[PDB]
């Protein structure tokens, strides 16, 4: 955390998304305003977002905590939707940062309950997999390019069970 | 040839090394064990060991005590209680010790003590040999 | 049996003093190791 | 049960894991050293036997355990213990010297009266020739000398091994009149003795140093044992743990909801 | 689990299969000190069985205590009687193990049957230490205890 | 109000642990679902939205700030409890205090590992 994880990621973007003409989408899932800020300047600073240049190579899409669940939940579909735009349209091999998808997941579960639905044991929406599956299956490699997914993934409860 | 084993608990210097002679400060005083020297068992005196090794060397040592062993077998065993190459003794100390030691002898008054001081004195002598 | 086997004296007794006297001799540099190499953590009991 | 119980468990095991390791590496350090430092000694002590080798002397009349002062970080002592009581049957005069208080410890088996002396805390800050000489010297004096017996010590053998030795212990200059004694000439119930002595010292030292080495590898080893055990054991539980943990949650969510959903 | 919990109420003899045991490859699989019959009696089972069993039950139970101990304490510094029992228990265990008489397909052996007295006797014998200065191996997958001794012999090679 | 008044405030929320309870109690009482750990799910959101309102602002906002010290009182180190866990995932670190030390008299009594300022090291006095 804060090790320049993001930085590394920027560097990756730099190495690749520059190199091969990949672009990036960042889905700030469960991000702190603070962290999105952090990124913001990091990108600004880095000039991998360039608010005067198209060397702003990243569209930042934010689906932060502070939103209603639905938004955060859906930010996943959304982020996908952009990259698909780049992918197919812009032929791209997209780097898709969805960070931290876990919180998205949480959101799914959050609503699950509040969708009157049973989520499941461990809280989890029982559809957890399908939600995912369907999401994941959008994300892929095709005859359209690739949406290559760099996903910040929290070790939930430092458990995985 | 004679296989010379030179050790102290501290160190093994030679271990059955084909040394031609070692001349020993045994309590004999010496007997300068030749490769053709009858096997013999000796208790070591404080004096100096000279390791005439079949190699154009005679190596210098002081040993305090212990036992030296001349096996029937080609091996000679210096099992030196304190084993030093003369290289590490301290001359300065010796003299200084020696006066002191004698002094203490002058004040020694058990047979044993006397023995001991004298021993010590002597020690300094046997060191003094080198030193 | 003379003065290091005195009338008595262990050869040890002697010996150790000899060696000890050697240890006493030599340089100091070495003597650090000396007692170190001639501890006597041998505490003693009869049982 | 519960995770409690488990953690209660875990807690310690983990502690253990560490502890064992503390004890381990420390032991290993000592050990490492002990071995290392053992080289000149090895020779030296091997030396000690010089002619005991080339003719042992028989005593129809000197059992002496040598162990460290602690154990149960291994059954180190138990080996000698074995070998010494076993000895004691065989023997003459059984007066015993225990270098090691883990020698005292075992010995009480008619070996509280039949100790002659005991030497103590030779580990925990090593033993030495200095010590050896000490134990040697006083040992003599006592009308106990050769009464045959053994010097039973832990002869270190390899990192992974030692084999606890037992010896013939002979110091009667008299049967070291007989035999070979002549042959490697230069002898006197002096020089004899003053080697017999010296080799008693050499051995006593040596053996001792082996002993301790053996222990140091043995505690380390004991600590090995443990940690390996520890680690799995932990491993296992922690799942089971987790499971039950989750079990909670799940169940609990049940209990709660759908246990106190619209249904309660 | 409630279900079994209930079940017990109706039971008369419980054959508790132990996964723990089983996994050791053991067939029989039973958790012995759970596999019971209430009609444990110095009368009905006669005391011979009963006691022998109680002694056995005990030792196994005791041993059981020890598992835990050795598990965590390695082994090796225990009472040697325990050491003995531990092994014995294993023999006993092993002896309790029987090859399969129908499932040579599973076993590659035939399985056996032990007329009860040879059994009571059996334990009495092991208890008697009669076998216990032996390797532990042979008792495994056996029928009558004598034969386990026989089996010992072949193994004592 | 201070934050926007370029002013730097510290609110210590003592305790939101207690809020969660109350709110759960509230939720459930509304005979309406809660969420996870039987606690309302978006209580996280709740708090997230609450807590996001604590911030370090630029100049436009007078540079003000709202510094938050939320407090959560653990029960037997059970941060694992989803809701604490929640809070953690929002926080900028958490300050773990350990009783053992306290009892030891060791005061500060902190569990150090668990005491965290996630990267709070970009506002440290060189002296320090």
PDB file of N, CA and C in Angstrom, chain B residues 8-12 38-43 66-67 70, chain D residues 37 39-41 44 182-187 191 194-195:
ATOM      1  N   UNK B   8      47.528 -28.900  20.333  1.00  0.00           N
ATOM      2  CA  UNK B   8      47.208 -28.311  21.581  1.00  0.00           C
ATOM      3  C   UNK B   8      45.740 -28.448  21.520  1.00  0.00           C
ATOM      4  N   UNK B   9      44.979 -28.298  22.573  1.00  0.00           N
ATOM      5  CA  UNK B   9      43.547 -28.471  22.495  1.00  0.00           C
ATOM      6  C   UNK B   9      43.008 -27.414  21.616  1.00  0.00           C
ATOM      7  N   UNK B  10      43.759 -26.317  21.593  1.00  0.00           N
ATOM      8  CA  UNK B  10      43.525 -25.124  20.903  1.00  0.00           C
ATOM      9  C   UNK B  10      43.725 -25.279  19.447  1.00  0.00           C
ATOM     10  N   UNK B  11      44.728 -26.043  19.015  1.00  0.00           N
ATOM     11  CA  UNK B  11      45.078 -25.958  17.635  1.00  0.00           C
ATOM     12  C   UNK B  11      45.700 -27.214  17.319  1.00  0.00           C
ATOM     13  N   UNK B  12      45.638 -27.584  16.054  1.00  0.00           N
ATOM     14  CA  UNK B  12      46.429 -28.634  15.511  1.00  0.00           C
ATOM     15  C   UNK B  12      47.250 -27.957  14.513  1.00  0.00           C
ATOM     16  N   UNK B  38      62.959 -45.236  18.584  1.00  0.00           N
ATOM     17  CA  UNK B  38      62.216 -46.179  19.334  1.00  0.00           C
ATOM     18  C   UNK B  38      60.965 -45.555  19.863  1.00  0.00           C
ATOM     19  N   UNK B  39      59.859 -46.229  19.870  1.00  0.00           N
ATOM     20  CA  UNK B  39      58.638 -45.659  20.317  1.00  0.00           C
ATOM     21  C   UNK B  39      58.738 -45.615  21.748  1.00  0.00           C
ATOM     22  N   UNK B  40      58.087 -44.652  22.307  1.00  0.00           N
ATOM     23  CA  UNK B  40      58.448 -44.192  23.567  1.00  0.00           C
ATOM     24  C   UNK B  40      57.296 -43.343  23.884  1.00  0.00           C
ATOM     25  N   UNK B  41      57.052 -43.115  25.168  1.00  0.00           N
ATOM     26  CA  UNK B  41      55.950 -42.328  25.648  1.00  0.00           C
ATOM     27  C   UNK B  41      56.487 -41.265  26.505  1.00  0.00           C
ATOM     28  N   UNK B  42      56.127 -39.990  26.340  1.00  0.00           N
ATOM     29  CA  UNK B  42      56.778 -39.029  27.173  1.00  0.00           C
ATOM     30  C   UNK B  42      55.831 -38.023  27.607  1.00  0.00           C
ATOM     31  N   UNK B  43      56.138 -37.462  28.737  1.00  0.00           N
ATOM     32  CA  UNK B  43      55.385 -36.460  29.341  1.00  0.00           C
ATOM     33  C   UNK B  43      56.177 -35.265  28.959  1.00  0.00           C
ATOM     34  N   UNK B  66      52.182 -31.553  28.948  1.00  0.00           N
ATOM     35  CA  UNK B  66      51.286 -32.402  28.270  1.00  0.00           C
ATOM     36  C   UNK B  66      52.041 -33.638  28.154  1.00  0.00           C
ATOM     37  N   UNK B  67      51.783 -34.371  27.096  1.00  0.00           N
ATOM     38  CA  UNK B  67      52.459 -35.576  26.832  1.00  0.00           C
ATOM     39  C   UNK B  67      52.691 -35.596  25.387  1.00  0.00           C
ATOM     40  N   UNK B  70      55.184 -41.235  21.114  1.00  0.00           N
ATOM     41  CA  UNK B  70      55.954 -41.690  20.035  1.00  0.00           C
ATOM     42  C   UNK B  70      55.391 -43.027  19.979  1.00  0.00           C
TER      43      UNK B  70
ATOM     44  N   UNK D  37      34.603 -25.160  17.001  1.00  0.00           N
ATOM     45  CA  UNK D  37      35.559 -25.102  18.014  1.00  0.00           C
ATOM     46  C   UNK D  37      36.072 -26.473  18.358  1.00  0.00           C
ATOM     47  N   UNK D  39      37.100 -28.704  16.270  1.00  0.00           N
ATOM     48  CA  UNK D  39      38.175 -29.231  15.452  1.00  0.00           C
ATOM     49  C   UNK D  39      39.491 -29.517  16.138  1.00  0.00           C
ATOM     50  N   UNK D  40      40.242 -28.612  16.759  1.00  0.00           N
ATOM     51  CA  UNK D  40      41.527 -28.898  17.360  1.00  0.00           C
ATOM     52  C   UNK D  40      41.327 -29.901  18.413  1.00  0.00           C
ATOM     53  N   UNK D  41      40.249 -29.739  19.185  1.00  0.00           N
ATOM     54  CA  UNK D  41      39.778 -30.657  20.159  1.00  0.00           C
ATOM     55  C   UNK D  41      39.675 -32.031  19.596  1.00  0.00           C
ATOM     56  N   UNK D  44      42.711 -33.458  19.206  1.00  0.00           N
ATOM     57  CA  UNK D  44      43.375 -33.455  20.467  1.00  0.00           C
ATOM     58  C   UNK D  44      42.936 -34.607  21.279  1.00  0.00           C
ATOM     59  N   UNK D 182      56.098 -51.284  27.462  1.00  0.00           N
ATOM     60  CA  UNK D 182      57.480 -51.474  27.340  1.00  0.00           C
ATOM     61  C   UNK D 182      57.934 -51.010  26.008  1.00  0.00           C
ATOM     62  N   UNK D 183      57.180 -51.418  25.008  1.00  0.00           N
ATOM     63  CA  UNK D 183      57.533 -51.344  23.651  1.00  0.00           C
ATOM     64  C   UNK D 183      57.703 -50.000  23.155  1.00  0.00           C
ATOM     65  N   UNK D 184      56.722 -49.141  23.392  1.00  0.00           N
ATOM     66  CA  UNK D 184      56.956 -47.762  23.168  1.00  0.00           C
ATOM     67  C   UNK D 184      57.385 -47.479  24.477  1.00  0.00           C
ATOM     68  N   UNK D 185      58.685 -47.438  24.596  1.00  0.00           N
ATOM     69  CA  UNK D 185      59.436 -47.452  25.784  1.00  0.00           C
ATOM     70  C   UNK D 185      59.211 -46.166  26.490  1.00  0.00           C
ATOM     71  N   UNK D 186      60.207 -45.646  27.233  1.00  0.00           N
ATOM     72  CA  UNK D 186      60.112 -44.402  27.984  1.00  0.00           C
ATOM     73  C   UNK D 186      58.889 -44.352  28.832  1.00  0.00           C
ATOM     74  N   UNK D 187      58.978 -44.875  30.045  1.00  0.00           N
ATOM     75  CA  UNK D 187      57.780 -45.007  30.779  1.00  0.00           C
ATOM     76  C   UNK D 187      58.181 -44.926  32.193  1.00  0.00           C
ATOM     77  N   UNK D 191      55.497 -40.722  34.089  1.00  0.00           N
ATOM     78  CA  UNK D 191      55.161 -40.397  32.733  1.00  0.00           C
ATOM     79  C   UNK D 191      53.986 -41.062  32.151  1.00  0.00           C
ATOM     80  N   UNK D 194      51.565 -39.537  33.935  1.00  0.00           N
ATOM     81  CA  UNK D 194      51.572 -38.174  33.529  1.00  0.00           C
ATOM     82  C   UNK D 194      51.307 -38.062  32.119  1.00  0.00           C
ATOM     83  N   UNK D 195      50.476 -38.957  31.659  1.00  0.00           N
ATOM     84  CA  UNK D 195      50.011 -38.988  30.347  1.00  0.00           C
ATOM     85  C   UNK D 195      48.682 -39.482  30.632  1.00  0.00           C
TER      86      UNK D 195
END
